[PDB]
Write a protein that binds this ligand. Structure first.
Ligand SMILES: CCCC/N=C1/SC[C@@H]2[C@H](O)[C@H](O)[C@@H](O)[C@H](O)N12
Ligand SMILES: CCCC/N=C1/SC[C@@H]2[C@H](O)[C@H](O)[C@@H](O)[C@H](O)N12
Ligand SMILES: *[C@@H]1O[C@H](CO)[C@@H](O)[C@H](O)[C@H]1NC(C)=O
Ligand SMILES: *[C@@H]1O[C@H](CO)[C@@H](O)[C@H](O)[C@H]1NC(C)=O
Ligand SMILES: *[C@@H]1O[C@H](CO)[C@@H](O)[C@H](O)[C@H]1NC(C)=O
Ligand SMILES: *[C@@H]1O[C@H](CO)[C@@H](O)[C@H](O)[C@H]1NC(C)=O
Ligand SMILES: *[C@@H]1O[C@H](CO)[C@@H](O)[C@H](O)[C@H]1NC(C)=O
Ligand SMILES: *[C@@H]1O[C@H](CO)[C@@H](O)[C@H](O)[C@H]1NC(C)=O
Ligand SMILES: *[C@@H]1O[C@H](CO)[C@@H](O)[C@H](O)[C@H]1NC(C)=O
Ligand SMILES: *[C@@H]1O[C@H](CO)[C@@H](O)[C@H](O)[C@H]1NC(C)=O
Ligand SMILES: [Cl-]
Ligand SMILES: [Cl-]
Lengths: 605, 603
C-alpha cells in the first residue's frame, strides 16, 4: 500500500509514511525527441533531482476531436514509465491550459470553431471538450499515480489561472471534480500562481493545494509568505524556479547568471521547500509548436532557455553548479555522468529550387480550395498550423502602385504577397498593414499567410489566424476569394509528389541531398544547421520538420538537428521553404546552400 | 579484363594500360579491431591514399599446425574486400616472416618444436611448414588479385631478407616459385630492403622487383640510387616511409615531427615515386602479440607509432599535414572526414583479489603439471604465450639467504619468485641473473615465468622462452621440476572457476555498469593503473595487453567500446605480477581508472 500525501501537521509531504521534499526539474517530452528521453532524464537524475515535472500539451495529443496521438514522440505514458524506471518521481501538469511558450498554451485550435468561445472558463462548449479530453488522458495517468505503483506524486490543475481575466471559480471546481473522478480521492492536486495576492486571488481553490512560482529576482521570504496566506500549513513549494528565460525573435537571447541561480536555489532549499527548476532542459519547439506573447511577438524555435542542460542536452557550467548546490542537502548519485553528445560539421550542402509554392498548389491542396466572398480564417478552412494561400483577382488596373491594406490590422501574422507571380513584399501583424502593389486589372493576387504561433498567455489566446478581417485595395474591400489550405507536411514527405503516395523572391521549396557513410560507429552525429544568405522559412530533413529559421532577425542563427533523423548510405533530403528571399538566383549555385556546423549559434546578435 | 604490371619503359606501373603510381599507408588488420576497420580505412581514403599496405601475420592465423583462424578479427579476406569496396588498392605483404614489432616476426612458435630449426632459410622443415601455409593462404588471396577483380596490386616476398644473416638464395627462389604457383605469372612480386648495397646484396633476387625503405633521416636521392643499381628501370618505390618509429618499455616514446615527414613525402612524390607510409595507423598489440629486439627489449602494448592516425584512430595534425601534401599531387575525395571517436572517462573502478596464481592452479592447469629432471622451455610444454609456473623444493636450508641464479642468463624473460608463498623478487633476462632467497629446506620454490614477446628482428628470432638453461642454488643445479603451463585466457573467461617490495602474483576483479538506451554510450576509453606495477589486463574476457606503469613510457591502455556492454556489468580482471595496491585496509586503493585521454609518452 503505497502512499503520498501532505502532512499539514508538520508542513511536509509524506511518502510511504516518511517525510519528503522534492527537488525537481522541468523537462517537456514534447520538446525532446523520444530518442533522447532517457539521456536527458538520466542526466537530470545524476544532477541530484529526485523528481521531474512536465506539461501534457493537449494540442500535441488531440489534433482534431476524437483523433489521438499517443505513440512515438507523443508517448507520454512511455516517458513517465522511463522516469519511473530511473527512480524519478513525477509532477504532472496536464493543464488543460499549460501556457509554456507553446502554441495557444496547449489548447487545440479547433476549440475556436465556436468563434465566441471563452477559453479557460465555464463556457459549456469549452467544458465539454475539456471533459472529453480528460476522459481519455486521465484514465491513462491513473496507473502511473504513486499509489498505483507509478511515479506521479502530484498533479497540477490548470496553470496560473490567477493571471487570467476571467476568474471563473466554477471552471476550477469542474476541473477538480473531474480530476477526482478519474484519478481518485488520494492524489495530491495543486495549483500554481505568481507569488502575490493579486494572482492568488483567482488562482487558488479550496481543496487544491496552493503553490507559487518565482525566480532569481524575487524576495524569497516575501514569496513564501504569499504562499503561507493561502496555505498556513503544509510544504513550501516553488513550482517554477526560473533557471533562465524565454526568447523572442529579434531580441537578444536571455541568460541568467549561474551564481544567481545557484544562490537562490540554496536559499530555497535551506527553507525546507520543495522546488522545481523551470526549465532544467528546455529543448526545441519543432514544427509549429512555439507560442507568442501579446503585443504580438512569437517565441523562436530554440527553447534552450539558458537551462542547466542546453538545447541538445549538453552539460553546462550551470548544470554542475546546481548539482553542487543540491549535494549540500542530499547525496547525489554515484558514477560518471552521461556526456554531452558529440556534434559533427557535415559542412556545406547545395540546394536547388524545385517548385514555387504557387506551382505546387495541386500537391499542397489535393482536395481543392474553398471559395468565399470575404476572407476566412485558418480555423474556418480547417487548417491550424503553417500556411494558407489566399487568392483573388485585381478589380482595377494598378499600373501605378495601389495600396493593398488590412485596415483593422487583420493579417495574422505575416503575408507574402505576389501579383501574377511577381513578389510585392510583406504584410505584418501590427507593423505594416499597407503594401503598395502593381499589376494589371484581372491579375492574380496571392497572399501566403503564416501562422507565426498562437498567443499562449494573456486575454488574447483566442488567436484565430489568417486574414481575420477584410483587405482593401485603394480603400475598396476586395471580394471573391479562393483559399487553399496547404498540406506542407504531407507534400514535403512525398517530395512534392515526386516520390508517389505509397527585395524578394517567390515563396518556394529548395531541396538538396547529402550522404553519410555506413559502418562508422560514431556517425551519424547531432549537428546544427545554419542558413547564410537565406531570410525566413521552415526547414525539414528527411521530412522531419525541424522548425522555423529566421537569420534576418536572430538571435538564433542555427537549428538543432538530432542524429536519429539522419540516415547512412541513403541520401538525406533537406527541404527549405524560403518565404522572403533565397540566395539562389545568380549563376553561382554554390550560394544556394546550407551549412552544418558543430556548435550552436543561438547568441550572435 | 584488368591488368597491373611494371612498365620498364616509362619507369612506371601501368594499371589497365595507363600510368599509375601509388600513395599508400600501412594498416595492420591484426592491430585494429574489425569493428573499426571501416573507420580507419575511410579516414585513410579521405587523406588521399589510393592504396593501403598490410602484413599477414602467420601466427595470427595458424596458431597450431592445421588449426586456422580466418573469422571475425582474423578475417583477412573480408578486410581486403572492405578496402576494395572503399576504392582502395592493396599492397599485400604475406611474409612468411614480416618483422613488424610483432611476436617472432609473425612466425609460429610451434616451428621451434624442431629445436635446431634455421628460420628464414632452406631448412627443409621450415620450408615444408611454409609451403603448407602458402597452400592455405595464397589460394585465398588469388581471387583478390587485381587481375581477378580484387584490390591486390603487388605482393611482397619475405621482408628485408637482406638484413638477415642467412643469405640463403634458394629460400628466396622457393618462395618466388610457390607464390607464382598459387597466384600466377602476372602478379607483380617484389622485395623490400634497406636502401644501401650492404642490405640489397642478400635481399634482392632476379624476377622479384627490388624496392627499398627509408625514413626522414636519409638522403632521398642516394636511397633511390641504391634501388636503381638493382633495378635500373621501373618505378621508384619506398615501401616503408617512416612517419614515426617504434617504442620499447623503459625508453622514451618515439616521435617524428610532422614538418619532416611532410617535407620528405613531398620530395618522394615529386620524383614520381610510389610510396607507402609506415605506419599510417599503428593500432595496438593486444593480448601477447608484441615483439622484441636484441639485446632483449620488448616493444610495448601501444603501436601508436606517432602515426598520422593515433592508436585510437584520431585525426592528428600530422594527418592533415600529409593530406595537404597529397592534395598537391592528386585530387582528394570530398565531404567531411569521419571524426575522432568520442572518449569517455568511466572513472575509478574498485577491484578485489580473487586468487593468487598459486591458489588457482586447478583452473589454470586442469591437465596436471609436467615433471622433468631439468627445466623445459615454453615450446616443450606446448605453451606459446603468456606465463608458465616452474616449481621445485629447496634441497638445503636457506635461513641465511642463498643465491638463486641462472648462470647462463636463461630466464626468458622474467620470473616472479616465491618461496613458501613469500615473494622473493624478480629475475630479468640480461639484467638480473641472481637473486638471494630464503626459506627452510623442503620449501616450495616457485618461479612464475613471463614470455615478454619473441624477438622479431635479427639473428635471435628462435627465441624459445621459459627457463631455457638450468638454475643454481648456492652454486648447485636445481633439479626435479614440476612445471605448470597456465591457461590464463580460459581461467579469466571463467572468472577463475568460481562462476555463480613485492606481492604474490594474483588476479583482481571488479565490475562497472554502463547505462543502456543512451545513444552515445558506450564510448572508447583508456585504462590506467595508479599504484599497480606490472601485469596483464582483460575486460569482459578480452585481453587488452600488458601494463607497466613502473617503467613506461606507456601508462594507459586503449579500450575499444565494442567489447563494453550495457545489458550486464562489465568485468575488469588484472593479473598483477610484482606489487598490487591492495594490501592496505583501504579498499579504494585497490582500483583502476578510466580516463578520456591517452598517456603513451610518460617521462
Ligand atoms: C508574467 C510572468 C509569468 C511567469 N513566467 C514564466 S516564464 C515562462 C513560464 C511559462 O510560460 C510557464 O508555462 C508559466 O506558468 C510561467 O508563466 N512562465
Ligand atoms: C632497424 C630499422 C630497419 C627499418 N625499420 C623498421 S621500423 C619498424 C619497421 C618494421 O619492423 C618492419 O617490419 C621492418 O620491415 C622495418 O625494418 N621496420
Ligand atoms: C525580503 O523581505 C523581508 C521582509 O519580508 C525583509 O526583511 C528582507 O530584508 C528582504 N530581503 C531581501 C533580500 O530583499
Ligand atoms: C504607397 O504609395 C503611396 C503613393 O501612392 C505613398 O504615399 C505611400 O507611402 C506608399 N505606402 C507604403 C506603405 O509604402
Ligand atoms: C468584410 O466586409 C463586410 C463589411 O462590408 C463585413 O460585412 C464583413 O463582416 C467583413 N468580413 C471580414 C472577414 O472582416
Ligand atoms: C535526392 O535523393 C532522392 C532519393 O533518392 C531523389 O528522389 C532526389 O531525386 C535526389 N536528388 C539528387 C541530386 O540526388
Ligand atoms: C643527397 O646527396 C646528393 C648526392 O648524392 C647531394 O647532392 C644532395 O645535396 C644530398 N641532399 C641532401 C638534402 O642532403
Ligand atoms: C644478495 O647477494 C649478495 C651478493 O654479494 C650477497 O652478498 C648479499 O648478502 C645478498 N643480500 C641479501 C639481503 O640476502
Ligand atoms: C642442465 O644441466 C644438466 C646436468 O648438467 C645438463 O645435462 C642439461 O643439459 C642442462 N639443461 C638445461 C636446460 O640447461
Ligand atoms: C559486480 O560488480 C560489483 C561492483 O559494483 C561488485 O561489487 C560485485 O561483487 C560484482 N558481482 C558479483 C556477482 O560478484
Ligand atoms: Cl513543467
Ligand atoms: Cl605494412
Amino acid at each position: 500500500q503505497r502512499m503520498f500525501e501532505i502532512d499539514y501537521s508538520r508542513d511536509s509531504f509524506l511518502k510511504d509514511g516518511q517525510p519528503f521534499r522534492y527537488i525537481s526539474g522541468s523537462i517537456h517530452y514534447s520538446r525532446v525527441p523520444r530518442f533522447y528521453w532517457k539521456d536527458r532524464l538520466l542526466k537530470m537524475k545524476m544532477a541530484g533531482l529526485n523528481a521531474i515535472q512536465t506539461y501534457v500539451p493537449w494540442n500535441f495529443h488531440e489534433p482534431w476531436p476524437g483523433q489521438y496521438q499517443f505513440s512515438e514522440d507523443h508517448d507520454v505514458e512511455y516517458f513517465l514509465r522511463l522516469a519511473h524506471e530511473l527512480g524519478l518521481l513525477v509532477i504532472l501538469r496536464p493543464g488543460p491550459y499549460i501556457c509554456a511558450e507553446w502554441e495557444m498554451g496547449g489548447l487545440p485550435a479547433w476549440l475556436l470553431e465556436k468563434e465566441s468561445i471563452l477559453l479557460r472558463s465555464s463556457d459549456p462548449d469549452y467544458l465539454a471538450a475539456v471533459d472529453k479530453w480528460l476522459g481519455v488522458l486521465l484514465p491513462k495517468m491513473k496507473p502511473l499515480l504513486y499509489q498505483n505503483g507509478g511515479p506521479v506524486i502530484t498533479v497540477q490543475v490548470e496553470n496560473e489561472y490567477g493571471s487570467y481575466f476571467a476568474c471563473d471559480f466554477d471552471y476550477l471546481r469542474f476541473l477538480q471534480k473531474r480530476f477526482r473522478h478519474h484519478l481518485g480521492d488520494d492524489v495530491v492536486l495543486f495549483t500554481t500562481d505568481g507569488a502575490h495576492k493579486t494572482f492568488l486571488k483567482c488562482g487558488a481553490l479550496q481543496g487544491l493545494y496552493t503553490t507559487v512560482d518565482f525566480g532569481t529576482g524575487s524576495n524569497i521570504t516575501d514569496a513564501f509568505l504569499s504562499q503561507r496566506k493561502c496555505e498556513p500549513k503544509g510544504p513550501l513549494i516553488n513550482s517554477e524556479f526560473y533557471t533562465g528565460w524565454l526568447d523572442h525573435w529579434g531580441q537578444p537571447h536571455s541568460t541568467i547568471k549561474t551564481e544567481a541561480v545557484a544562490s537562490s536555489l540554496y536559499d530555497i532549499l535551506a527553507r525546507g521547500a520543495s522546488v522545481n527548476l523551470y526549465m532544467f532542459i528546455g529543448g526545441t519547439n519543432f514544427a509549429y509548436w512555439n507560442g507568442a506573447n501579446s503585443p504580438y511577438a512569437a517565441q523562436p524555435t530554440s527553447y534552450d532557455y539558458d537551462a542547466p542542460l542546453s538545447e541538445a542536452g549538453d552539460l553546462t557550467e550551470k548544470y554542475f553548479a546546481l548539482r553542487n548546490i543540491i549535494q549540500k542537502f542530499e547525496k547525489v548519485p554515484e558514477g560518471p555522468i552521461p556526456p554531452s553528445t558529440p556534434k559533427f560539421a557535415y559542412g556545406k550542402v547545395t540546394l536547388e529550387k524545385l517548385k514555387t509554392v504557387g506551382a505546387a498548389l495541386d500537391i499542397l491542396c489535393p482536395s481543392g480550395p474553398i471559395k468565399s466572398l470575404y476572407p476566412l480564417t485558418f480555423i474556418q478552412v480547417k487548417q491550424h498550423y503553417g500556411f494558407v494561400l489566399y487568392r483573388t483577382t485585381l478589380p482595377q488596373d494598378c499600373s501605378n502602385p495601389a495600396p493593398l491594406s488590412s485596415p483593422l490590422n487583420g493579417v495574422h501574422d505575416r503575408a507574402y504577397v505576389a501579383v501574377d507571380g511577381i513578389p510585392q513584399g510583406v504584410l505584418e501583424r501590427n507593423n505594416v498593414i499597407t503594401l503598395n502593389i502593381t499589376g494589371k486589372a484581372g491579375a492574380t493576387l496571392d497572399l501566403l499567410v503564416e501562422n507565426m504561433g498562437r498567443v499562449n498567455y494573456g486575454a488574447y489566446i483566442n488567436d484565430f489566424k489568417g486574414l481575420v478581417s477584410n483587405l482593401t485595395l485603394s480603400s475598396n474591400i476586395l471580394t471573391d476569394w479562393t483559399i487553399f489550405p496547404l498540406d506542407t507536411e504531407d507534400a514535403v514527405r512525398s517530395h512534392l509528389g515526386g516520390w508517389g503516395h505509397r527585395n524578394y523572391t517567390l515563396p518556394a521549396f529548395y531541396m538538396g541531398n547529402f550522404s553519410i557513410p555506413s559502418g562508422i560507429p560514431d556517425l551519424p552525429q547531432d549537428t546544427f544547421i545554419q542558413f547564410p544568405g537565406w531570410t525566413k522559412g521552415q526547414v525539414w530533413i528527411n521530412g522531419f520538420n525541424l522548425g522555423r529559421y529566421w537569420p534576418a532577425r536572430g538571435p538564433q542563427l542555427t537549428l538543432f538537428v538530432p542524429q536519429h533523423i539522419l540516415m547512412t548510405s541513403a541520401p538525406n533530403t533537406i527541404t527549405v521553404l524560403e518565404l522572403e528571399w533565397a540566395p539562389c538566383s545568380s549563376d553561382d549555385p554554390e550560394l544556394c546552400a546550407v551549412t552544418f556546423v558543430d556548435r550552436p549559434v543561438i547568441g550572435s546578435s
